[PDB]
Symmetry: T
């Protein structure tokens, strides 16, 4: 794949609980939208989700060998805690865009800090699912303007 | 199960090393006591331990689909570091009680901070194995008239 | 007495205001429950409440001459401010368990700090009145195994 | 206008001479792109730039009386300093998205703090001029689903 | 003239617990020594101890009334907490020397801060009961050079 | 429609020392002015002063049972140190206005923090005795518009 | 003798938005009330409002040359940010009283800090429009005792 | 002009108030001295003062188009607050020297921090008017080989 | 005797990227050198690398059951984040030496803190692969003096 | 059993400047008084002053070889800065008393911190030259009870 | 001497390593330039450099006895660490100007703090050798206007 | 010499007191081993110890003139305090390795901070005398690969 989308812990829960909390949108719905958006541009896109830090790090290492050109990553809770993730990305030297569904700055103070943002190309937060689509549009443009 | 008891990393070591250090009580002994206490009240109780953050997060997710009503969790070292665990509990919206065998406030300053305590119903620390039993007693009363 | 239960400032207000707000449970109800629980184990139990730091200190000093074996203390607001109270407990060297009705970690940041917790056997918070009962159960087992 | 795009201090330097900017892009080029994007959705869009905090505040107040439904704001340096701006936006209660051309997290530590981000719908940084277009896309969908 | 010696909370315990721990010296022994030392210089000396902050404040107010020229105070735990005590001393404008039996700098970090030390003539700590005698020697010389 | 005015520690010293220092105005003068101002509006007003935290807490608890509608409080040194006071006011749920004679912000840094101000209707400081009159004027309007 | 009342940024919005949000009182209403209050005491009073820091600073400099004796200032958001404003007031050496409509201490932590309060005669916050009337009452008594 | 001298807010007050306070020297006297010093070296020098941040930012932008080679700036209070000013200077990439009349380190702690000093060639403070002459001397020497 | 060498997350990447960046030395090369050095002293050297925290915790627990005498550990990114690792080492009570290839003090501030260093026998950083050899030399001498 | 008195940097200046600023007492006067006090108790006492840290460290090392039993040290400015001094005292394991002429707590905040006080037997400050005499009186009692 | 120039540790290295690095200017050259400048004004000027803190302190003490009227000091690294130096300058009460060749604010955070700057007449940094000449100009004018 | 070994304050005390406390190893023993190790590799090695900061700085300057290629330095206490040392090493641009006998991370929190570690090639602590040998091994390989 040329673009890899990574989702961090707890994102698998999207749309599961009381679909009038945060409605009906699922992680799969998001993935399908992105895969279709990428197919439109003849770009190959892979997706990955895990609750396990190590599985995400392993997947990043694999991305390097597969010739992934850009990573779109929503590290979820791991953005505030995982230097291992930072060092995986940097160690494979694949540029990345950081995405969060919710506005990270509007929540508790510990969510204001990120071990990834300072090394990302850019960061999108608080725009829901469309944030991932925006990241993908940017990525496509960078590769095939 | 109605009640799920979760033990974090390193709690599998209980009673393994020099049973004159901290004596002979094992994690299994704790679990047996709790299972018997729950059986006495005709409540179904399950237990889980892991050294792997992701395994705990996955287990919490599964708790939601199983209809667990309350979680009793000793996150051990993960209390001070895991936002992923916080967000797992909050994401499934299962109420929980936090338990530690030892008095966390009597140890190093980094153990005074918890990513769970502020969202727990309550917190018990420093009362050894009985802490879990107390949490269970509370839980039983909350769930049953 | 063998066991002494101390309640700090403002706890006399329990159940007084709009008993629907936090319901109907009074300080006296709590004391009666504890006195009965103690009688059931043939342990003598005394109780004390004051809004005056000095009265609490004096009472602790008296506990020493009376041969009190363990103190269960809900210092309420004094937990965050009274080094005098810490030094009274340490000076008479009577082991103690700290109890709070409400979850101190779920409130303002200044409530996260305690001049007692680090010297307590353990701490219970957020489990309402049952917290004192749990502390008593522990205490009984410790004194008369 | 339905949508108002605000550019803060020093943004007038883009392209005219490039302060330290890269791409040869100018503020007028950005505006033309957004106006055309907005026309394409039959949404009316105005733009505004100033180096003067008071002018921006006045403009926000004027937005209220004009029935503006959403503000896309690149406050530039004022994001780190201007509580007056925060209070203008909150006082008129117009929702806003915050946009920065550059990655504000990749620079000095003082740029990590914002008096706006916590109250924004969301924040986009580091994606250049496309950041504004993404905001506008989000805004269009929100206003005209 | 008149010197007043004030002892804070818990100092009444001196020599009561296991005279092995820190031995046999009592608060009354200290007071006797000081009263004799003062009598030897034909200076009138009064003493006061309380566990109650308000009593100590009242006593300081009374001091002014009695024309006390200098206060020797061991505030004990109140040194780290009582602004009321600071303001009492300042409000009557009686100069004072602060004394502690134990070395306050050699204990927990919270004991390093004092609401009195910056307004004392001087501070003596860690020299046991002699600290009070030294303070009295100084005071005598200051009042009757 | 009773109003209660509470004065904290050390306020009894007003006008006692060197009536040139802070002038001749006494606490009793302030109380007389307030009682007369309240009588002019046919509002019943009581006053209370103590050096003792517990006396103040008790007096607040009594205010509830007496049907006091608003408290005007100058906690003096206790504003920076008493959570017990905060919790007494909040526990009786009587609205209050915080007053200080002097400008608390112009003094030492530790005086800049208050355990009351965030819960007060408002705060007045630095305007001398008039501050209490202003608080009373506001209170009267609020209770009997 | 001349009193100048200065209103800072965003205060022009008063009473504009949903008059049940914060009701119907306007900045003009406030000024009318203060002008009438001043006429009643035969004091000349001027008023000023701006969203522009430099306009306010200029106005302060003009106040010096006009012989203004006292300034009543509600700096609004500038209280937390503007050292320029501090230095303008200090540079002209006109005493001032700081007023806020809302209780600044009851909001975000950054609103607890002021570049003005420590140099003000006093401060009033959280008493709404009356706060300005109180400041004027004080000012009148100070200028014409 | 080859050199531009910028004076920040409140510097227009120099020598206005009680000329035996901080003397008779005026902003004009400073400017006249600098213009004469520059004329003596056949260097063209312009000067600018404003109380309005945006005007200063605009003036810096204009300096770029006028071919200014070096800026001598006394940002006065804006040194501690204005990131806009920092980003103007950096954006036009004109080197600058920072000057203050008074010793910024000898005052309040907040004046120890600057958004400019770290990017300045150098900083002169506390040497009165001669500071600007020294900055100009330096600048002349630099604008040569 | 067995010595166990643990390599943390991302160390599997050594000598993959740009072998002129940090050259050609691989994790396997390091291990082979260590194994040969251990064989020379008739000590068994076991090695382990993982990207997964839990795997490393499990491996430490396994070390205890197999009678490992000393651990040499490069936790890599987990140094700064993993209390679980600290508690694993301490729980098994195997002595350990901490090693880093790069100079952790020369990088970002968050790399300055270690959850292991305070409990390690010692620490080596910045000496590349030779660090591990040095740790092993020390370890051999400690096991076989 | 010798006592050694150590005076730090700048103490040689005592009584040199404007003998009315701090009067006439010189370092040599202090030393003569202490030497006489010691002779009176048949204790051998040596003294030492230097402006050079290393000289003081060397002198402490020499004290060990000379069999000194107790050090009375006024480190002056070195109390706040010199870990080398701390480590010299600890390394030779000679107990010490810290003395300062002035009240170190009444000055700048940086003077509140000491690298000695926590390891001293005790500390005396603010009692002038008598402080050294008091330390000597204590020392005599400790060595010859 | 009338004016004394003091150079701190490591300044002897100027011009001694890689003259195209920091070029060819030596500490001697700086001194020769100053001595000549002083001769032009018939002012007697002495200079001093040392790597040893004590030597500098001694030299400052000597300056007092010589009747030195002003000190120009570049403390180099000692500015951030030496309270001994601060106290020497203050103890002899000779006014001083602080000079640094390089811009101390543009370097590591620890270099932003000075134990001298707050007591200096003023401070010059970042203007190379000319800084000292400026300081000397100022000093000459102050001493012989 | 090609390599220079520097030992800081108090290291001369090694093996002097209670050779059971830390045994018998002396500084001279360490130097002899290093000299022998260096001779074995045909490298010239010099050593130096002092308790005086200035002596160490002077010695470092001298190392430059002697062509020293690498410094092995145990700064002991000066690591936490001496910017002068840092600047000496940087100013001569001789690479260096930092060594401590004891584990600096296992002691007080202030020992965690170093003014050298960040500019060292690497750091070794806690491995006793062997730490110096290791540094020498590394240095030999760097200089004569």
């Amino acid at each position: 794949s040329t673009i890899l989308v990574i989702h961090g812990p707890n994102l698998n829960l999207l749309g599961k609980r009381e679909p009038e909390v945060y409605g009906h949108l699922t992680l799969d719905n998001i993935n399908r939208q992105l895969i279709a958006q990428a197919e439109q541009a003849s770009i190959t896109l892979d997706t990955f989700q895990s609750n396990w830090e190590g599985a995400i790090v392993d997947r990043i290492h694999q991305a390097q060998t597969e010739g992934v050109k850009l990573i779109i990553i929503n590290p979820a809770a791991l953005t505030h805690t995982s230097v291992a993730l930072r060092d995986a990305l940097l160690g494979v030297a694949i540029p990345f865009i950081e995405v969060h569904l919710s506005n990270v700055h509007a929540r508790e103070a510990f969510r204001h800090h990120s071990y990834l943002s300072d090394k990302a190309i850019g960061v999108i937060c608080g725009l829901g699912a469309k944030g991932y689509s925006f990241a993908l549009d940017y990525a496509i443009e960078k590769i095939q303007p």
